[PDB]
Design a binder for this molecule. Structure first.
Ligand SMILES: [Ca+2]
Ligand SMILES: [Ca+2]
Ligand SMILES: [Ca+2]
Ligand SMILES: [Ca+2]
Ligand SMILES: [Ca+2]
Ligand SMILES: [Cl-]
Lengths: 366, 366, 366, 366, 366
């Protein structure tokens, strides 16, 4: 992922303009090859027209240039691009929201699975490790970076996510389908065992744990669904054919004709179609947005950082359920115990922007 | 379904371009018949104009070609296509999300319906078989492939989803409506019986089972709703009439006229309207996207694999509630029991991409 | 409703094309009157131009035709149509999802309200009859067909939805607002009474019943909201004025002028503006989609079958809570009790399409 | 609000056309002033061109008319109008869904807060009065009509929503923010007191009451959010500038030039630009849709009837929790106690439309 | 934020027109610098054309002006602007809905965490202070204004949100990730301790507290997600390149040519391209909407008032859980205890608008 929200915190004079100077995850890094290809074909065709082609053939070539320029439609391709890219962006954001995150699970576990002893600590750590393991399994199924990090289940075992005995139980299961759901079933069994053993004190807490487990598992299933069910291939081919047809039309129809013929709208030759190159940037980049977001778990610069999320979730969950279990500072009175109003101070840098009348409603200025 | 998300993992130089070489579920497999039809009529009309028609009639024909070319509107049809196809894609994705999946139900059942004996195992297996049976009934009601797999309720009985006695109870019910809901009512009765018999230990667990059953059943009802309530026929006819009207206008208005008349914008004859064929690919394929997704439970290559989902759900649910019930590896300390940080290693292939500073927030680089 | 999803199960050569041959709920049944009106005015104006008008007045008339043709904008009306029709379709689908359906309620009732005796059966039947009655009341408030089926509350009483005593309690309430909510309050009181009497065994079950009752009632309230709050009249008038203004411009601006004057783009007279008639089909039908879906509870062919849904819900709910209460086939072992894999057979018609490698993930083909 | 869904129940020959004859909440009532202004400036400019301006200045004026007509872009403004109005309509509908309605709360209260005595009745009435009071407070904060109905908190006290003692507690709180949330905190305290006193019998019921209270309060907070956070002013200014720029271009560029000069596309003078007036209706009304819906709690004819909703909710909630508490007709057998099928009769007006085969699925006609 | 919903309460004659006179958060405050830049380059180029350039070079310059005017496409950029700005507005509103608000938490705490003594008050205050602290941590991570208010964790400690001992526990945790989640884990531990100590009376109440805590924490996580995952940089660059390419085309192609050459569509020179300046306002402001909303936690005038929300939430939560805990006015009969109807009076200003027949349904006027 490429984060630039710090740069665009305000609508400045040169806010979006300086974003064109970035390289990592930029339009240039995605297009420059197609840009050089389009420029190469355009320059080769222009050179052939200027030198190689006969005078007789040049009249036919320029008539074909006019014909190809008449059918260069830039408006209709904008519709198919807008709709297709909007669908791809919707899928991309929903895919990000489906990342297996264990924050809800860690909060429930640290608040419901009890015991300062070795067994309670084993319960909490194993409950969160099961969710981490199912996250790792689904992500290595869907993400190329995680798969290269965990090429085999042996890599998962050496990483500490799954144990030797859990590995034997995992491989002995007779199923031809992806087994990312297995640690979730293990989580359900372990939660039921903890409730039976009294580690979970109340019936509500067990229900809350299974509700939060099914939310986590549904996110894993949704990542599998997005991975399996692509954007329909026919629609991707339609947008690609529209864009490539328009650019093939622009390659010939926008060729610089000899001004000596005096054809209208073609009485100039700048030997570089800079406005056609700007249109190429526009439409080719608009397609490149979808081409980068269509599978957001690849190795694009703007693709999701799945390995970082795995590491963060594992470390934070272990910290929260093990070192932070029932480890609280003693209850004491805050700065505003005796104060009628509870208001924090402002720094010298924020006071002169703040201290303004508080909004009470639209109807109170009558 | 045609899955190609592996191919588009990155925005490559030839990423979307190579997707035009695929055949299964492609634009070509859907259009080539209409493509040959349009080319046949265009070539026949051009040949009649060149040879059969009189010189006097050819002036009238070319005037009619100019008239038909003036009304060839390619922009307005793009709007109706964009909106209609977006609605169809919304329905298509929501229909996929309505597939009867039993993962949530299997997690709740394995965590709440207890007993290593024959009766507890019968309870778990039958509870998941009821959900599987209702899934099979709704899918054979909505999917052509599942219907050809289960042409009669006898096929459902031989498949093991429903028993002889359950079949007699099923057929004896006096109702003229689809009975896909019957196994859900059986599930509710069986869950209540299990709670009464003590197989479900706590009141919360029974509530969680009925909540998850009503989610499963609502998905079945939603598939029935999508099957019954089509995209409004008037709107489908509007988009079809717009596309076919535009292509009838393009068939005549884009006819290659004799250059001897010297008509403007018609001083060339390539005997093949390749740019009109590219526009045909574009608009006809854009309509074909909706034509393929309007009923995603048919036998199109990109249609949903309902039989595979039935098989996967049945096998996985039986495995999870029967062989995985209370079958856990003993609780043991993980690799990071004594480690302050819980972090997994990286392979040689991922280390040189990873090991980058972790994102802390937009405001921490001031 | 007009269901055609069986016809469009696959993207065939003549898939959408044959949908233009349907009549029930089609574009033709909605437009043919406006079509005849537009053709009548066009033909009358053309005949007046050809015969009645003087030679001197014909120059002014053809200048006015050119002027009216210059302002015939077909692109801008497409935007207002697309956005307005998308809003209407969103409201139409959300209105369908708000239909009062009692499947969730019947599942909860059959699983929570107990007793094989007359009193338990009365409890279950009356609980579902209250939800049915509130559904009937809201639907007769919003649907013309249901209102013609239940013109008075006497018709509701004779239909068996409400009793004589319930009628007296209903009419004695002092309120000037629609009383569709009354049976929901009766449901809440009856559920509380059943819990107090021990018919509902557990506290969770009572909470689940009130949660499912409030979902049912919110759907009834949402139907009332959609009925009360129309699509804003100003926006409907804007779309109607845009469409009618464009068609008034097309009626005159597309008039066939006498070729003897030699005006450009008007050197032909086919005495029938077939391309203008196709554009009429397009835009008038696009408006007709909204005109049919704006109130989906009327008597249009594609409008919702509210009476059928009332009958289905009543019959199915009574069956589920009365004849299916605790009526289960005895627990027995299924076909796959001893099988490691639980897989159903395939018919001869589906085997040669199926038996393909199961999708495991995008990253497993490296 | 202007309700016309009865008129548009069917797609009739003159369905939407007769909606142009309505006045209350119509396009005419919103535009006629701007319409007269635009016509006044157009007629004054045309009269000045015809009479006051010199012959020499008229050539410059008509050149400026051609220049202003060349930049009159009607397509691009349609995009900004479509997107902006769609956003405003989304906000408008979501604002309607955020109205503080107490139906869910009344159902829970009547089903959970018990006692036929004075204290139980006081509990139920006060619990619903607290929700009503918070609704009144937020609505008088956001709605001009409710504010004019309750200009002071004294008006709230005289209306019976808040008492003298509750008023003293309300004013004594030290906070500079809107106190619409205060009755919700009172509701929580009163519910906890009722549970402690045994008026609420079960722990689940208390949880259901606090869940329904937080839904009600979130709707109040969401109304406050919509009131505070306007549609971004920059975007409103963009749409206004686009529309006004286009209409300033149309005021001059569409001026009727003298036909004596023989300028192309300007060889007529109808002294009234009726097609420009129709375009004014279109674009100005499209902007007026947003201008009316941007704040739906004002005094527009199509604005929400907040006072009516306050009255309805108060009266219905008091009726449901006080007169309908545990007031049920005795349980008796319905018309279909002995009938295998539970089906209601049809009137003579609906039988000949109904009695059609019931939809069973798409796959059952093979 | 700039609130103007009071001004637009009604669709007035000069409603949106007077919004163009505002300055704070207006289009002018965002664009005037780019406006002066564009005018400066246009005037400099026009002056160079008029004076500095030779007569021979002026023919080439005006041919280049015609060439650049032919490729000035204002329609296609409208599509990319509409779609991109709609995505940005969707993200902006969802980001506002993700603000950490503690109203739901305060209602649950005041209704579930009991005790008039010092320990119960400490419990309630600390529970709400933990949620406030996590809100402050995430907001100072995402908002520039909050970061300038809390540049260090020392500022958080002096503000009273976190204590000395809580600070030592906070810093001693070994994690390289943002620790905004830590106070949520503390909340879970404190809630579990309160339930164990009997401060929370019932098991349901503890579950409701953890459910509301996970909603609060998910909102904090969602703010972190929006901060980390920007709108894809490629798409922002595409929209910026399209807008800047169009304006570079308009800078030259719309240059006022010398009328002495008699070029068509260029026979005038107003030395100021006011219609090009209006188009600049339109497109540049449309981009500025996204440029301001892309990061809504900056210091733009229309950006969210995060500091005000922190202050409001802290003060209101402390008031609700401390001064309002079990502090109720005694239960007494309301104004409508003996009244069959519960209806409030209307003021003289609202009666003559109100007192209209109540909407009962669409079907009751037959
Ligand atoms: Ca900003
Ligand atoms: Ca990618
Ligand atoms: Ca299909
Ligand atoms: Ca209708
Ligand atoms: Ca308004
Ligand atoms: Cl619950």
């Amino acid at each position: 992922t490429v984060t630039y929200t710090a740069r665009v915190a305000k609508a400045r004079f040169g806010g979006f303009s300086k974003l064109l100077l970035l390289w990592r995850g930029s339009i240039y890094k995605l297009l420059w090859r197609e840009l050089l290809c389009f420029l190469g074909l355009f320059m080769a065709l222009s050179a052939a027209y200027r030198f190689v082609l006969t005078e007789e053939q040049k009249r036919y070539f320029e008539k074909l240039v006019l014909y190809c320029d008449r059918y260069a439609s830039l408006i209709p391709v904008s519709f198919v691009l807008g709709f297709y890219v909007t669908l791809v962006v919707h899928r991309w954001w929903n895919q990000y929201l489906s990342m297996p995150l264990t924050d809800a699970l860690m909060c429930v576990v640290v608040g419901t699975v009890h015991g300062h002893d070795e067994r309670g600590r084993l319960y909490r750590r194993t409950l969160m490790r099961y969710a981490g393991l199912s996250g790792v399994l689904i992500l290595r199924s869907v993400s190329t970076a995680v798969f290269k990090r965990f090429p085999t289940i042996d890599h998962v075992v050496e990483a500490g996510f799954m144990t030797r005995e859990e590995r034997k139980k995992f491989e002995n299961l007779n199923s031809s389908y992806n087994k990312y759901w297995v640690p979730c079933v293990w989580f359900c069994n372990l939660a039921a065992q903890a409730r039976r053993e009294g580690r979970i004190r109340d019936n509500g807490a067990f229900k809350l744990l299974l509700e939060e487990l099914n939310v986590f598992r549904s996110k894993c299933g949704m990542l599998f669904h997005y991975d399996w069910i692509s954007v329909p291939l026919v629609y991707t081919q339609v947008v690609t054919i529209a864009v490539y047809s328009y650019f093939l039309a622009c390659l010939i129809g926008r060729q610089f004709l000899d001004p000596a013929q005096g054809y209208k709208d073609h009485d100039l030759d700048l030997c570089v179609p800079i406005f056609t190159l700007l249109q190429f940037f526009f439409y080719a980049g608009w397609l490149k947005v979808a081409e980068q977001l269509i599978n957001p778990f690849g190795e694009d610069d703007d693709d999701f950082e799945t390995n970082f999320l795995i590491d963060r979730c594992f470390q934070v969950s272990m910290l929260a359920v093990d070192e932070m279990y029932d480890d609280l500072a003693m209850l004491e009175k805050d700065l505003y115990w005796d104060a009628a109003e509870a208001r924090a101070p402002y720094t010298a840098a924020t006071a002169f922007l703040m201290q303004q009348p508080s909004f009470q409603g639209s109807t109170f200025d009558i």
